[PDB]
A paper describes a structure:
[name] ([name]) is a key enzyme that is essential for the synthesis of purines, thymidylic acids and some amino acids. [name] catalyzes the reduction of 7,8-dihydrofolate to 5,6,7,8-tetrahydrofolate using NADPH as a cofactor and plays an influential role in folate (FOL) management in many species. The M20 loop of ecDHFR can adopt three conformations (open, closed and occluded). We determined the structure of ecDHFR in complex with FOL and NADP+ under pressures varying between 0.1 and 800 [name].
In the M20-closed crystal, the M20 loop was confirmed to be in the closed conformation from 0.1 to 400 [name]; NADP+ and FOL were also in their proper positions. The volume of the M20-closed crystal was 32 520 Å3 at atmospheric pressure and was reduced to 31 440 Å3 at 800 [name]. For the M20-closed crystal, the numbers of water molecules assigned were 87, 135, 134, 108 and 41 at 0.1, 220, 400, 650 and 800 [name], respectively.
Author numbering: 0 to 159
Amino acid sequence: HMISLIAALAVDRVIGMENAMPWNLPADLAWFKRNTLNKPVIMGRHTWESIGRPLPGRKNIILSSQPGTDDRVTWVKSVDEAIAACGDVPEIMVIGGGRVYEQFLPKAQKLYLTHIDAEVEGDTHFPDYEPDDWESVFSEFHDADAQNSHSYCFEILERR
Ligand SMILES: NC(=O)c1ccc[n+]([C@@H]2O[C@H](COP(=O)([O-])OP(=O)(O)OC[C@H]3O[C@@H](n4cnc5c(N)ncnc54)[C@H](OP(=O)(O)O)[C@@H]3O)[C@@H](O)[C@H]2O)c1
Ligand SMILES: Nc1nc(=O)c2nc(CNc3ccc(C(=O)N[C@@H](CCC(=O)O)C(=O)O)cc3)cnc2[nH]1
């Protein structure tokens, strides 16, 4: 198979605040749906709570050391089990949050990263990643507009 991480980062690699995403960027949410639809998505229990409902058209796999509390999604207790629950698929999408990104980054072949030109009070950060290990294979910058209040750049990195 192949493991990919997808995330949106504000300044200083901030990805969250008090278990929430403090911004609204509809173009980035559309990019997220386009790149995760019809794929399995792995997330940690905190991120499941922040989303609050299953993502439709995706197999939702939740990592937690505690028993599952919702039969609409798949609960797993380890990284190995999470990967196995995905089945034989071309690409597995890991959708955070911080503690989960840390664990899957050494396994990942691709990073789908949105860089948001926004300064945000945050407590959760994307993991420190060594830039030499990665090559940029796609980059697309967008200015702010009437629907998206900050400029942003989509990037796909591939492990060298
Ligand atoms: N901007 C973005 O792209 C983005 C993406 C995702 C999330 N976020 C933000 O990230 C923040 C949450 O990230 P987080 O780091 O606090 O928590 P998280 O990584 O979402 O989930 C952490 C929890 O997942 C479970 N877990 C993780 N690894 C496990 C393992 N190997 N085995 C078993 N259980 C495991 C544990 O749950 P138990 O305690 O139940 O064992 C752990 O407490 C929120 O602010 C969210 O909004 C942002
Ligand atoms: N690039 C990126 N941006 C994000 O905002 C993001 N968020 C998470 C975790 N949080 C969330 C929060 C909401 C939705 C969500 O509502 N998505 C719906 C609607 C998409 C839309 O409205 O365009 C979905 O169907 O994917 C997804 C993930 C993980 N990876 C990300 N990756």
